[PDB]
Amino acid sequence: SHMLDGWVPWPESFARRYRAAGYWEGRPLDRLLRERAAADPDRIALVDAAGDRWTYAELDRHADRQAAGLRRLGIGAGDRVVVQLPNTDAFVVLFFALLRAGAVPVLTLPAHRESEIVHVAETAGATAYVIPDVLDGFDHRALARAARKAVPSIEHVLVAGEAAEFTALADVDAAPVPLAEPDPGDVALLLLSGGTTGKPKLIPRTHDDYTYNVRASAEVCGFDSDTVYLVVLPTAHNFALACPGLLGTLMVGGTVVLAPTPSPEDAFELIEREKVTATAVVPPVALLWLDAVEWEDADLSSLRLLQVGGSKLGAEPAARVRPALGCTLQQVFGMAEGLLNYTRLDDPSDLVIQTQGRPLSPDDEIRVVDEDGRDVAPGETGELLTRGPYTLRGYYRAPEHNARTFSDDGFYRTGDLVRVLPSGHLVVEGRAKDQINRGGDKISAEELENHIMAHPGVHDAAVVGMPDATMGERTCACLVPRAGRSAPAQRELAAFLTDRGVAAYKLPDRVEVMDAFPRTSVGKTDKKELGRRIA
Numbered sequence: 001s002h003m004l005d006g007w008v009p010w011p012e013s014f015a016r017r018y019r020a021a022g023y024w025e026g027r028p029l030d031r032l033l034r035e036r037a038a039a040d041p042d043r044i045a046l047v048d049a050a051g052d053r054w055t056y057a058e059l060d061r062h063a064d065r066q067a068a069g070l071r072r073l074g075i076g077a078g079d080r081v082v083v084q085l086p087n088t089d090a091f092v093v094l095f096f097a098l099l100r101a102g103a104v105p106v107l108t109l110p111a112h113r114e115s116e117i118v119h120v121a122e123t124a125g126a127t128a129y130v131i132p133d134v135l136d137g138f139d140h141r142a143l144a145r146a147a148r149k150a151v152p153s154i155e156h157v158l159v160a161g162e163a164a165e166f167t168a169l170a171d172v173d174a175a176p177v178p179l180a181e182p183d184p185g186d187v188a189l190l191l192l193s194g195g196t197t198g199k200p201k202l203i204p205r206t207h208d209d210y211t212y213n214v215r216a217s218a219e220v221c222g223f224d225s226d227t228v229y230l231v232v233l234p235t236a237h238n239f240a241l242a243c244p245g246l247l248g249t250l251m252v253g254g255t256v257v258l259a260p261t262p263s264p265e266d267a268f269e270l271i272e273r274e275k276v277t278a279t280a281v282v283p284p285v286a287l288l289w290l291d292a293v294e295w296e297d298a299d300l301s302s303l304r305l306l307q308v309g310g311s312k313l314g315a316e317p318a319a320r321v322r323p324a325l326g327c328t329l330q331q332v333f334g335m336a337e338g339l340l341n342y343t344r345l346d347d348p349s350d351l352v353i354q355t356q357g358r359p360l361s362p363d364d365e366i367r368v369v370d371e372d373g374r375d376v377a378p379g380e381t382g383e384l385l386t387r388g389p390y391t392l393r394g395y396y397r398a399p400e401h402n403a404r405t406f407s408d409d410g411f412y413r414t415g416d417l418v419r420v421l422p423s424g425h426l427v428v429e430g431r432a433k434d435q436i437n438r439g440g441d442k443i444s445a446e447e448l449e450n451h452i453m454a455h456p457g458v459h460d461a462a463v464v465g466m467p468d469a470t471m472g473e474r475t476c477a478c479l480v481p482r483a484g485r486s487a488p489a490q491r492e493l494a495a496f497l498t499d500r501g502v503a504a505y506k507l508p509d510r511v512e513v514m515d516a517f518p519r520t521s522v523g524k525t526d527k528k529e530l531g532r533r534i535a
């Protein structure tokens with residue numbers, strides 16, 4: 001019996017291998033803090049952007065108090081809680097308090113709006129929603145009111161700030177209570193995938209596979225008690241949470257330092273002030289920092305490791321990382337679904353510059369296949385399929401999408417196009433999935449098309465990616481105007497999408513209007529040819 005239904009557990013044969021190999025160590029996710037705080041209670045665990053800092057024993061205690069307060073509210077074993085918080089200490093405490101209460105965090109980003117939040121809350125049948133009050137000029141409590149009208153299961157709303165009619169997250173606090181450990185083979189959290197279908201999809205990560213993700217990534221990244229990790233991406237991003245992210249920093253006893261934004265203004269000062277040794281960024285932020293050192297005077301010398309992932313860093317800026325930033329580059333080809341590829345920190349610089357890494361686990365299995373599903377010859381380009389000790393066997397409550405996306409023997413189809421080199425390192429060559437990668441931000445084309453076509457002037461919509469030198473891809477919305485009406489232009493369509501509740505990173509960069517969409521045989525919209533007609 002598993003505490004949650006709607007997910008697809010590993011076959012018992014694989015489970016026994018991964019336990020025998022020491023990958024699945026049988027420990028709840030919250031135990032990495034409990035254990036580090038018992039051994040190093042007085043070490044500084046967490047620093048925020050203001051300079052406020054907390055020990056391991058203070059983090060562990062506060063998480064115990066907030067787990068107790070959550071239970072006084074009825075948020076307990078197996079309930080799903082949508083979490084949408086900025087890079088604050090409030091997120092870190094709530095993450096471990098939800099785990100210790102038995103609740104399942106459903107992690108969303110600050111940029112997500114009503115469309116994403118309502119669907120994610122509905123799919124998970126979430127019983128609570130955790131928000132800030134106002135962030136980047138948006139009042140998230142308005143969003144929480146709209147979410148509660150569409151999703152009746154939401155009983156509580158916890159606000160990191162002025163809670164209005166809702167519950168203040170700071171008041172969720174009570175004397176610690178003995179709370180039962182969860183089964184380590186159960187789902188610990190739900191991640192939001194970037195998406196390839198009309199509706200976002202949630203990824204269950206179990207305690208055993210996510211601990212191993214964190215533990216093995218910290219080993220390969222040299223994370224130790226002397227690591228000062230700067231959280232530049234959102235705390236809810238798998239990359240900054242667990243690869244090794246903040247959980248890996250806390251697992252080994254380093255210091256987590258929270259950045260409010262990735263701008264040099266904020267990031268470079270925290271690196272100088274806190275003596276940050278490691279961080280992780282997307283390539284657009286990499287290029288910015290690579291530029292900004294020529295007019296910023298911050299001392300960044302404590303930097304030892306810059307991870308760059310989410311999209312492919314080019315070889316020319318990759319080669320600039322050591323001269324400009326004085327640190328080692330690690331390319332990270334990962335996914336919230338599982339498989340992580342890392343360059344090794346002592347790889348020859350050729351491989352750190354030209355490749356996106358090699359798999360994290362000895363039991364990560366890699367297949368590269370052609371259109372006919374057939375394995376390619378060595379060193380040819382095909383679609384990557386993967387199976388392993390921390391890669392999901394199925395999305396959460398998405399059986400139709402599961403039947404298209406995983407092979408009969410359990411291989412997850414990444415939708416990425418790759419080459420495997422003789423050393424085992426991968427080179428990302430492109431994408432088979434219909435998903436735009438806008439500076440690391442993933443845009444499901446089908447989701448956005450369903451949004452655009454709901455506009456009264458749009459009949460059909462085909463969303464196509466465009467190369468961009470600094471963003472990697474931008475978004476073009478190709479529109480067939482509704483019969484005898486005028487399709488909207490770029491600013492009006494963007495305004496319609498915002499009020500419909502679409503995250504701002506999914507707003508099209510460009511609008512193209514045409515009479516019909518190029519079609520292949522079988523009658524599907526040819527977006528390879530649109531990529532040409534719109535050029």
Ligand SMILES: Nc1ncnc2c1ncn2[C@@H]1O[C@H](COP(=O)(O)OC(=O)c2ccccc2)[C@@H](O)[C@H]1O
Nearest residue numbers: 194238239243309310311312332333334335336428
């Ligand atoms: N270094 C890279 N080069 C080229 N493409 C990369 C890449 N890293 C991710 N990708 C692409 O993002 C997809 C997964 O994105 P996701 O938002 O779930 O998480 C990371 O994006 C993510 C999660 C954990 C660690 C790192 C990135 C991958 O399938 C791939 O298409």
Ligand SMILES: [Mg+2]
Nearest residue numbers: 301302303326
């Ligand atoms: Mg340095």
